[PDB]
Amino acid sequence: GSFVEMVDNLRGKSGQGYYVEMTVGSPPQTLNILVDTGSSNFAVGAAPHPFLHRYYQRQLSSTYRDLRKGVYVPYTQGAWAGELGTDLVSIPHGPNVTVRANIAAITESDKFFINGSNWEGILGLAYAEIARPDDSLEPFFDSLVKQTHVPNLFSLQLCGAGGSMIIGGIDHSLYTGSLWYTPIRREWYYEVIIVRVEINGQDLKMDCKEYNYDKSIVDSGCTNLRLPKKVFEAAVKSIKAASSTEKFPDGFWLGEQLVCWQAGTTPWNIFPVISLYLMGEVTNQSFRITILPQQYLRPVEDDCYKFAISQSSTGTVMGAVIMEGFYVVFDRARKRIGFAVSACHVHDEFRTAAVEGPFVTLDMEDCGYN
Ligand SMILES: O=C(NCCS)[C@@H]1CN(Cc2ccc(F)cc2)CCN1
């Protein structure tokens, strides 16, 4: 592909977030920006903070325009407050363009910036509907598409232990096998529909509406695979039974406790695979995406791991757990999301992550929550 200058543009430590190099203002002030497909605001630190090494200085930028309006944005994890404005933004290792975008200048925050994360801002890649204060505040990618010839598409390859955010196209060297697409249900979050869940080839036997109770979303700005109360309970009991060859403390299945082994001795074989079936583009068709323990058990600072599946009250969140196993294509132009086996995904000599289809499924439209 012609996106070789875009490959390997992502960095970020385990459980802290993946970020891209971006510049704001004139002359260009370089900052590292969290890639977040679960929000829609572009906001950078614009005042000193204990965890910030650098921040956006508006007085040093000649192209800064004050919108003279304060903004507050709460997330599931973290919140910030700031002042709205516009300025020139560029992505050094992305498309060779410069755009005027809405930037929220973060002057106040809580549980947002992470110590040692190395990022100083957030790139909300989702749609305008879920942007604060309202959908009149144009997200960065909408600005980028409207002002340049860069196509209405981006793709993410999150690599657990870097990765690539390809803006405008698809690099074929970042995946193996075929690309399977699932329809975007609504343009707010990256809402998808899960039709079936399997733990080590065993169906959870639940009404498929439970898998999407509230919503099912694709979110790079989330560490965990988060599941609705009912689905989480059913999943944990199934994972616990499949991995009964070793006993673990009850706090481990809650993220409260860690589990450790000797270096290189980690027995991945005892932990089951997890398959999420996603609605296909063709009527009565579906495809499954299968993740390994390497994805849902994440290394902690002997090799120690944290159980990276948690419970949710706001629906299914397909986080980095899911996305680190796959090359994900956010095809906005065709209202669909693509999944392919990542070339950088962590696996062993016995098992690998999989994207397989098609599968026959009757009554798919029901699976969505109303
Ligand atoms: O609410 C949020 N995500 C959903 C909960 S998992 C995000 C959390 N993010 C910090 C963060 C992002 C990515 C990551 F890998 C680890 C941490 C700040 C913005 N809001």
Coordinates of C-alpha atoms and ligand atoms in Angstrom, one line a residue:
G1 CA 0.0 0.0 0.0
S2 CA 0.9 3.7 -0.5
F3 CA 0.4 4.3 3.3
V4 CA 3.9 3.2 4.3
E5 CA 4.6 6.6 5.8
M6 CA 1.6 6.1 8.0
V7 CA 2.5 2.6 9.3
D8 CA 3.8 2.4 12.9
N9 CA 2.5 5.9 13.8
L10 CA 0.8 4.7 17.0
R11 CA 2.4 4.3 20.5
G12 CA 1.1 3.7 24.0
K13 CA 1.7 1.6 27.2
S14 CA -0.5 -1.3 28.3
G15 CA -3.9 -0.2 29.7
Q16 CA -3.0 3.5 29.3
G17 CA -4.1 4.2 25.7
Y18 CA -2.9 4.4 22.1
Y19 CA -1.8 7.8 20.8
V20 CA -0.8 9.6 17.6
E21 CA 1.5 12.5 16.9
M22 CA -0.4 15.7 16.1
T23 CA 0.4 19.4 15.9
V24 CA -1.8 22.3 16.9
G25 CA -1.5 26.0 16.0
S26 CA 1.2 28.1 14.2
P27 CA 4.0 27.6 14.6
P28 CA 3.1 23.8 15.1
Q29 CA 3.1 22.7 18.8
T30 CA 3.5 19.0 18.9
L31 CA 1.3 16.9 21.2
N32 CA 0.5 13.2 21.6
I33 CA -3.2 12.5 21.2
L34 CA -5.2 9.6 22.5
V35 CA -7.1 7.8 19.7
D36 CA -10.7 7.5 20.9
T37 CA -13.6 6.1 18.8
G38 CA -15.9 6.2 21.8
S39 CA -16.1 10.0 21.9
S40 CA -16.4 12.9 19.5
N41 CA -14.5 15.8 21.0
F42 CA -11.0 17.0 20.1
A43 CA -9.5 18.4 23.3
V44 CA -5.9 19.0 24.4
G45 CA -4.3 20.0 27.7
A46 CA -4.0 23.8 27.6
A47 CA -2.9 24.4 31.2
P48 CA -0.2 22.8 33.3
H49 CA -1.0 19.5 35.0
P50 CA 1.0 17.0 37.3
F51 CA 0.8 14.3 34.5
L52 CA 1.4 16.7 31.6
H53 CA 5.0 17.3 30.3
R54 CA 3.7 19.7 27.6
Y55 CA 0.5 21.5 26.8
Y56 CA -1.2 23.7 24.2
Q57 CA -0.3 27.4 24.5
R58 CA -3.0 29.4 22.8
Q59 CA -1.2 32.8 23.2
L60 CA 1.8 31.5 21.1
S61 CA -0.5 30.5 18.2
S62 CA -1.4 33.2 15.6
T63 CA -4.1 31.1 14.0
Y64 CA -6.0 30.5 17.3
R65 CA -9.6 31.7 17.3
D66 CA -11.5 32.0 20.5
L67 CA -15.1 30.7 20.4
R68 CA -15.6 32.3 23.8
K69 CA -17.6 29.3 25.3
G70 CA -16.8 26.9 28.1
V71 CA -17.2 23.2 27.7
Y72 CA -17.6 20.3 30.1
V73 CA -17.2 16.6 29.0
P74 CA -17.7 13.6 31.2
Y75 CA -16.7 10.1 30.1
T76 CA -17.2 6.7 31.6
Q77 CA -13.6 7.0 32.7
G78 CA -12.4 10.5 33.4
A79 CA -13.8 14.0 32.9
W80 CA -12.5 17.4 31.9
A81 CA -13.5 21.1 31.5
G82 CA -12.2 23.7 29.2
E83 CA -12.8 26.5 26.7
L84 CA -13.8 26.1 23.0
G85 CA -11.8 27.5 20.0
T86 CA -10.5 26.7 16.6
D87 CA -7.0 26.3 15.2
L88 CA -4.8 24.6 12.5
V89 CA -4.2 20.9 13.2
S90 CA -1.9 18.5 11.4
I91 CA -0.9 14.8 11.7
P92 CA 2.9 14.5 10.9
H93 CA 2.7 10.8 10.3
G94 CA -0.8 10.9 8.6
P95 CA -2.2 12.6 5.5
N96 CA -0.1 15.6 4.3
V97 CA -2.8 18.2 5.0
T98 CA -3.6 21.0 7.4
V99 CA -7.2 21.7 8.6
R100 CA -9.0 24.2 10.9
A101 CA -10.7 22.1 13.6
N102 CA -12.6 22.7 16.8
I103 CA -10.3 22.3 19.8
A104 CA -11.4 22.3 23.4
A105 CA -8.7 23.8 25.6
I106 CA -8.5 21.6 28.7
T107 CA -8.0 23.9 31.7
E108 CA -9.4 21.4 34.3
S109 CA -9.5 17.6 34.6
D110 CA -10.3 14.6 36.9
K111 CA -9.0 11.0 36.5
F112 CA -8.4 11.8 32.8
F113 CA -4.7 12.2 32.2
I114 CA -2.7 9.1 33.2
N115 CA 0.7 9.2 34.8
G116 CA 3.4 8.0 32.3
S117 CA 0.9 7.6 29.5
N118 CA 2.8 10.1 27.3
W119 CA -0.4 11.6 25.8
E120 CA -1.6 15.2 26.3
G121 CA -5.0 15.2 24.4
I122 CA -7.9 13.2 23.0
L123 CA -9.0 12.6 19.5
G124 CA -12.8 11.9 19.4
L125 CA -13.3 9.9 16.2
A126 CA -17.0 9.2 16.6
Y127 CA -19.9 11.1 15.1
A128 CA -21.4 14.6 15.8
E129 CA -24.5 13.4 17.7
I130 CA -22.6 12.4 20.9
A131 CA -20.4 15.5 20.9
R132 CA -20.6 18.1 23.7
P133 CA -22.3 20.5 24.0
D134 CA -24.3 19.5 20.9
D135 CA -24.0 18.1 17.4
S136 CA -23.2 21.6 16.0
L137 CA -19.6 21.2 17.3
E138 CA -18.0 19.5 14.3
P139 CA -15.7 16.6 15.1
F140 CA -12.1 16.5 13.8
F141 CA -12.7 13.8 11.2
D142 CA -15.8 15.6 9.8
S143 CA -13.6 18.7 9.4
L144 CA -10.8 16.7 7.8
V145 CA -13.2 15.1 5.2
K146 CA -15.0 18.4 4.4
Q147 CA -11.8 20.4 3.9
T148 CA -9.6 17.9 2.1
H149 CA -9.6 15.0 -0.5
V150 CA -8.9 12.5 2.3
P151 CA -11.7 9.8 2.0
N152 CA -14.4 9.3 4.7
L153 CA -12.5 6.3 6.1
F154 CA -9.9 5.3 8.7
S155 CA -8.4 2.0 9.9
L156 CA -6.9 1.0 13.3
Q157 CA -4.3 -1.7 14.1
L158 CA -3.7 -1.7 17.8
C159 CA -0.6 -3.8 18.7
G160 CA -0.3 -5.3 22.2
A161 CA 3.1 -6.5 23.5
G162 CA 2.4 0.2 18.9
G163 CA 0.4 -0.1 15.7
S164 CA -1.0 2.0 12.8
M165 CA -3.8 4.5 12.3
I166 CA -4.3 4.6 8.5
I167 CA -6.3 7.7 7.6
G168 CA -7.9 7.6 4.2
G169 CA -7.3 4.0 3.2
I170 CA -6.4 0.4 4.1
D171 CA -2.9 -1.1 4.3
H172 CA -3.1 -4.8 3.3
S173 CA 0.2 -5.7 5.0
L174 CA -1.5 -5.0 8.4
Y175 CA -3.8 -8.0 8.2
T176 CA -4.1 -11.6 7.1
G177 CA -7.1 -13.4 5.6
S178 CA -10.3 -11.8 4.4
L179 CA -12.0 -8.6 5.6
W180 CA -15.5 -9.1 7.0
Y181 CA -17.8 -6.1 7.4
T182 CA -20.6 -5.4 10.0
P183 CA -23.2 -2.6 9.5
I184 CA -23.1 0.5 11.6
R185 CA -26.5 0.6 13.2
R186 CA -26.5 4.4 13.9
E187 CA -24.0 7.2 13.4
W188 CA -23.3 8.3 17.0
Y189 CA -21.0 5.8 18.6
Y190 CA -19.7 3.1 16.3
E191 CA -22.7 1.0 17.1
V192 CA -22.7 -2.6 15.9
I193 CA -24.9 -5.6 16.6
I194 CA -23.7 -8.9 18.3
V195 CA -25.9 -11.9 17.3
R196 CA -24.1 -14.7 19.2
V197 CA -21.4 -15.2 21.9
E198 CA -19.3 -18.4 22.3
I199 CA -16.9 -19.4 25.1
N200 CA -14.6 -22.2 23.8
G201 CA -17.2 -23.2 21.1
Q202 CA -20.1 -23.3 23.6
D203 CA -23.1 -21.0 23.0
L204 CA -24.2 -18.8 26.0
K205 CA -27.8 -19.5 25.0
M206 CA -29.2 -16.0 25.7
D207 CA -31.6 -13.8 23.8
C208 CA -29.3 -11.8 21.5
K209 CA -30.9 -8.5 22.7
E210 CA -29.0 -9.0 26.0
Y211 CA -25.7 -8.9 24.0
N212 CA -26.6 -5.4 22.9
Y213 CA -28.6 -4.3 25.9
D214 CA -28.4 -0.5 25.5
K215 CA -25.8 -0.7 22.8
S216 CA -22.7 -2.5 21.4
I217 CA -19.9 -0.2 20.4
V218 CA -16.3 -0.3 19.0
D219 CA -14.1 1.8 21.3
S220 CA -10.3 2.2 21.0
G221 CA -10.5 4.6 24.1
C222 CA -11.4 1.7 26.3
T223 CA -9.0 -1.0 27.7
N224 CA -11.6 -3.7 28.5
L225 CA -14.2 -5.8 26.8
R226 CA -17.1 -4.5 28.8
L227 CA -20.3 -6.6 28.9
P228 CA -23.9 -5.9 30.2
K229 CA -24.6 -7.3 33.7
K230 CA -26.3 -10.5 32.5
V231 CA -23.8 -11.3 29.7
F232 CA -20.8 -10.6 32.0
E233 CA -22.2 -13.1 34.6
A234 CA -22.9 -15.7 32.0
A235 CA -19.4 -15.2 30.5
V236 CA -17.4 -15.3 33.7
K237 CA -19.1 -18.6 34.8
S238 CA -18.3 -20.1 31.4
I239 CA -14.7 -18.9 31.4
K240 CA -14.3 -20.0 35.0
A241 CA -15.6 -23.5 34.2
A242 CA -13.3 -23.8 31.1
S243 CA -10.2 -22.8 33.0
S244 CA -11.0 -24.9 36.1
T245 CA -7.7 -26.7 35.6
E246 CA -6.2 -23.9 37.8
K247 CA -8.0 -22.2 40.7
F248 CA -8.0 -18.4 41.0
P249 CA -9.1 -15.9 43.7
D250 CA -12.6 -14.4 43.2
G251 CA -11.1 -10.9 43.0
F252 CA -9.2 -11.8 39.8
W253 CA -12.5 -12.2 37.9
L254 CA -13.3 -8.6 39.0
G255 CA -10.1 -6.9 38.0
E256 CA -9.3 -6.5 41.7
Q257 CA -6.6 -9.2 41.8
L258 CA -3.8 -10.2 39.5
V259 CA -2.6 -13.7 38.5
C260 CA 1.1 -14.3 38.0
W261 CA 3.4 -17.1 36.5
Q262 CA 7.1 -17.6 36.0
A263 CA 8.6 -15.9 32.9
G264 CA 7.7 -17.8 29.8
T265 CA 5.8 -20.5 31.6
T266 CA 2.3 -18.9 31.2
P267 CA -0.1 -21.6 30.2
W268 CA -2.5 -20.0 27.7
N269 CA -3.9 -23.4 26.9
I270 CA -6.0 -23.6 30.0
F271 CA -7.9 -20.4 29.1
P272 CA -10.7 -20.6 26.5
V273 CA -11.2 -18.7 23.3
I274 CA -14.0 -16.1 23.0
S275 CA -16.0 -15.7 19.8
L276 CA -18.3 -12.7 19.1
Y277 CA -20.6 -13.2 16.2
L278 CA -21.4 -9.9 14.3
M279 CA -24.3 -9.2 12.0
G280 CA -23.2 -9.5 8.3
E281 CA -24.0 -7.1 5.4
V282 CA -26.0 -9.9 3.6
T283 CA -29.4 -10.7 5.0
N284 CA -29.5 -13.8 7.3
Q285 CA -25.6 -13.8 7.4
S286 CA -23.1 -13.4 10.2
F287 CA -19.4 -13.8 10.8
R288 CA -17.4 -14.5 14.0
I289 CA -14.4 -12.9 15.5
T290 CA -12.4 -15.0 17.9
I291 CA -10.0 -13.7 20.6
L292 CA -7.3 -15.5 22.7
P293 CA -6.4 -15.2 26.4
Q294 CA -3.5 -13.1 25.1
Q295 CA -6.1 -10.4 24.3
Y296 CA -8.4 -10.5 27.3
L297 CA -5.5 -11.0 29.8
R298 CA -3.3 -8.0 29.8
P299 CA 0.3 -7.7 31.2
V300 CA 0.8 -5.7 34.4
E301 CA 3.9 -3.9 35.7
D302 CA 7.5 -13.3 36.6
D303 CA 4.7 -12.4 34.3
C304 CA 1.5 -10.9 35.9
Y305 CA -1.8 -10.4 34.2
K306 CA -5.2 -8.6 34.8
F307 CA -8.5 -10.0 33.7
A308 CA -9.6 -7.4 31.1
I309 CA -13.3 -8.3 30.9
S310 CA -15.5 -6.2 33.2
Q311 CA -19.2 -5.5 33.7
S312 CA -21.1 -2.6 32.1
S313 CA -24.4 -0.7 32.7
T314 CA -24.2 1.2 29.4
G315 CA -24.0 -1.8 27.1
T316 CA -21.3 -3.8 25.4
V317 CA -17.9 -2.0 24.8
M318 CA -15.6 -3.7 22.4
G319 CA -12.3 -2.2 23.7
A320 CA -8.6 -2.8 23.1
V321 CA -9.1 -6.4 24.2
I322 CA -11.1 -6.9 21.0
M323 CA -9.2 -4.5 18.8
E324 CA -5.6 -5.8 19.6
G325 CA -6.5 -9.1 18.0
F326 CA -7.8 -7.5 14.8
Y327 CA -7.2 -4.9 12.0
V328 CA -10.3 -2.8 12.3
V329 CA -11.6 -0.7 9.4
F330 CA -13.9 2.2 10.2
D331 CA -15.6 2.6 6.8
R332 CA -17.7 5.7 7.5
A333 CA -18.5 6.3 3.8
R334 CA -20.2 2.9 3.5
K335 CA -21.7 2.9 7.1
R336 CA -19.8 -0.3 8.0
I337 CA -17.0 -1.7 10.2
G338 CA -14.4 -4.2 8.9
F339 CA -12.6 -6.9 10.9
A340 CA -9.6 -8.9 9.8
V341 CA -6.9 -11.0 11.6
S342 CA -4.2 -8.6 12.7
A343 CA -0.6 -9.3 11.5
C344 CA 0.7 -7.9 14.8
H345 CA -1.7 -9.7 17.2
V346 CA -0.2 -11.7 20.1
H347 CA -0.6 -15.5 19.7
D348 CA 1.2 -18.8 20.3
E349 CA 2.3 -21.8 18.2
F350 CA -1.0 -23.6 19.1
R351 CA -3.7 -21.0 18.6
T352 CA -4.3 -17.8 16.6
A353 CA -7.0 -15.2 16.4
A354 CA -9.7 -15.8 13.8
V355 CA -12.2 -14.0 11.5
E356 CA -14.5 -16.5 9.9
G357 CA -17.8 -16.7 7.9
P358 CA -20.4 -16.8 6.6
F359 CA -22.9 -18.3 9.1
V360 CA -26.7 -18.7 8.7
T361 CA -28.7 -16.6 11.2
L362 CA -32.5 -16.1 11.3
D363 CA -34.1 -13.0 12.9
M364 CA -31.1 -10.7 13.1
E365 CA -32.9 -7.4 13.3
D366 CA -34.3 -8.4 16.7
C367 CA -30.9 -8.4 18.4
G368 CA -30.9 -4.6 18.6
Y369 CA -32.2 -2.8 21.6
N370 CA -35.1 -0.3 21.2
Ligands
LIG1 O1 -14.2 6.6 29.3 C1 -13.3 6.1 28.6 N1 -13.4 4.9 28.1 C2 -14.4 4.0 28.4 C3 -14.2 3.2 29.7 S1 -13.1 1.7 29.3 C4 -12.1 6.9 28.2 C5 -10.9 6.6 29.1 N2 -9.8 7.3 28.6 C6 -8.5 6.9 29.2 C7 -8.0 5.6 28.5 C8 -8.1 5.5 27.1 C9 -7.6 4.3 26.5 C10 -7.1 3.3 27.3 F1 -6.6 2.2 26.8 C11 -7.0 3.5 28.7 C12 -7.5 4.6 29.3 C13 -10.0 8.8 28.9 C14 -11.2 9.2 28.0 N3 -12.4 8.4 28.3

